[PDB]
Amino acid sequence: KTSALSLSNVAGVFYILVGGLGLAMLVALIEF
Amino acid sequence: GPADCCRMKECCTDRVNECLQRYSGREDKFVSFCYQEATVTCGSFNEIVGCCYGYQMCMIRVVKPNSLSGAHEACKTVSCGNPCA
């Protein structure tokens, strides 16, 4: 079966998620 | 400690003969048994074949009750065939 648990590889997409949310917070702030 | 197939052959025939001598009148029945004992005593390059196969076949097909001596005397010079197969 070879259990994967690929969390390291997915972590990057999690990081680009956090980055997108950060920029989102930035836009939300510059708006208000 | 080499076996030397020629010596093995002479031993084979000798042990078969000496064994069959013990059984009088039943000689044609016990050929295979005595051949087993001979293959055991003289050793074999192939446990299936035995020390000398051609001699065994010759004896089995020739030997009749009480006919032992002449039959063996006729069969002991025969070619043993392939000792490995």
Binding site: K1, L5, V13, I16, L17, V18, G20, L23, A24 | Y35
Partner: protein
């Protein structure tokens, strides 16, 4: 055989394997049953699913991280929104694609692999130990065998420690059951089929037979009983008595049969 040669018994009826070494000393009637040297192992457990197999492909860390990521996206949206929805969409896209792909890999791997096919496979792996009885026609066959695979197997078995040989059939089967499938038992196809049909039914036969031979009824050489016994065995064969008998003792009353 000893009793027959030395005349302590007039006839021998038993699962006696026909061999050349035995055919030289005794007379074998035509074979009343067919068999062959075969492989017995422990049947793999069908399922132990749990709810954990669903959380297996996606790591626990990924679940925690996606939950916190989820609440983070919610609290970000609570405070523009277009790129949030887009980034979250891309995120969950990569995640569902990864889950699908990984689970696919799991199922593919699980469907791809087979434990054992033939004897040759047993010769090619050191993980699963295997053995035969302490004596009898199977062991002697392996010893006297000049065929490559069987030769290798014999060398391994004789050389391997601790000894792979067992005294009785029930002991070998017991070892098959206790070894969690790390031990394979080489025994004639008949006994294998019989044990495979008896509860707990945790054991099974894999692949074909290594060799093709049969049992037989033995009579002293030059005995009067030989020809009548032989012709009788033939009669029983054609009449189907042997078939019905084997079905009687082996299969028909089989609990797992």
């Amino acid at each position: 055989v000893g009793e027959l040669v030395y005349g302590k018994a007039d006839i021998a009826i038993a699962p006696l394997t026909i061999t050349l070494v035995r055919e030289e000393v005794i007379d074998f009637s035509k074979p009343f049953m067919s068999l062959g040297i075969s492989i017995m192992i422990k049947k793999p457990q069908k399922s132990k699913p749990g709810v954990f197999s669903f959380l297996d492909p996606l790591a626990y860390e990924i679940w925690m991280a996606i939950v916190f990521a989820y609440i983070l996206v919610s609290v970000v949206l609570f405070l523009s929104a277009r790129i949030v929805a887009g980034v979250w969409w891309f995120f969950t896209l990569i995640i569902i694609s990864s889950y699908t792909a990984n689970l696919a890999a799991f199922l593919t791997v699980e469907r791809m692999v087979s434990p054992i096919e033939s004897a040759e496979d047993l010769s090619k792996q050191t993980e699963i130990a295997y053995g035969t009885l302490d004596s009898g026609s199977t062991k002697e066959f392996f010893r006297r065998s000049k065929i490559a695979v069987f030769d290798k197997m014999w060398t391994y078995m004789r050389s391997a420690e601790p000894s792979v040989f067992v005294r009785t059939t029930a002991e070998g089967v017991a070892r098959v059951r206790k070894s969690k499938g790390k031990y394979a038992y080489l025994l004639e196809s008949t006994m294998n089929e019989y044990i495979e049909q008896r509860k707990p039914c945790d054991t099974m036969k894999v692949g074909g037979n290594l060799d093709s031979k049969g049992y037989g009824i033995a009579t002293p050489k030059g005995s009067s009983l030989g020809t009548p016994v032989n012709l009788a065995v033939l009669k029983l064969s054609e009449q189907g008595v042997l078939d019905k008998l084997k079905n009687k003792w082996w299969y028909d009353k089989g609990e797992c049969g």
